[PDB]
Design a binder for this molecule. Structure first.
Ligand SMILES: [Cl-]
Lengths: 61, 61, 62, 62, 61, 61
């Protein structure tokens, strides 16, 4: 499995590390797949690069 | 957060549903994010559409 | 014998493969026919492509 | 599930009725589906209506 | 189907959520029923509001 | 736990017997409760005794 996760930029290396591990375990667990086959890509979203409903996420929320 | 997960085709609706849930909870847990903000897209990979080391995954396993 | 089986989508490769095997054995057994002559085609039915009583199956379930 | 089974003509009512029952049970069993959702259609193939390898089946048998 | 489940209070949101899901699936499965049509009400029982044998349950387990 | 399940009418004994068992196990499983403590009441709804949206269910949708 290959997960690409889009997240708003603003987080700790530690927190992102936790995301990677937690997600990888959830994938491996629920697909009954080896952990080794699980790859996670995290793609950070700059403050003005993500929109919800045509507004900026930063603005509305 | 928006996770797109690429997986090999061949799984029950039940198992995919559990992937979605488990992954969503891992994301919302580790980012301290509302669940409501978590979106998961599952993109299935046909047997002949995913290669590992230049050779088909079904093959290479 | 050639069986075409229409089933609702949503099942594991494993389960469909069991269906194929089980059905094949039931045909061969009951017709006293060689297994080799038994062919099975599964045709999956998308969640809006199968109706019971004019309503979607998804909605009545049976 | 809806199975349509194509078989060569020439069989007893009994034997076909066993086919229907056996197949139905194999489907219900392997899909973990209610028996009562299982429908089987048997379509018989006349002696000159089924070909294997471009030659009539009656002639080549399998 | 409409299930109202009476349970003793004292359990995680997480855990009640899983009750709802599991029970819904058991109903839909065993009645061959659309899930959509399954509705579950959890009503909670305060420690002094549930009696077994004229005794408080709290007490008698 | 005590579930009361409202269901339409018109089913097997066998099917209702499965419902009871399936549900009971889902409750016991998800609450980590003893089976023995699980009670299920099933209440059947006559053809003209259940309404969805003010019409009869027999008739919706
Ligand atoms: Cl109790």
């Amino acid at each position: 499995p290959i997960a690409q996760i889009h997240i708003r930029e603003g987080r700790s290396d530690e927190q992102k590390e936790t995301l990677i591990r937690e997600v990888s375990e959830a994938i491996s667990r629920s697909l009954d797949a080896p952990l080794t086959s699980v790859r996670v890509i995290i793609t950070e979203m700059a403050k003005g690069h993500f929109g919800i409903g045509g507004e900026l996420a930063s603005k509305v929320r």
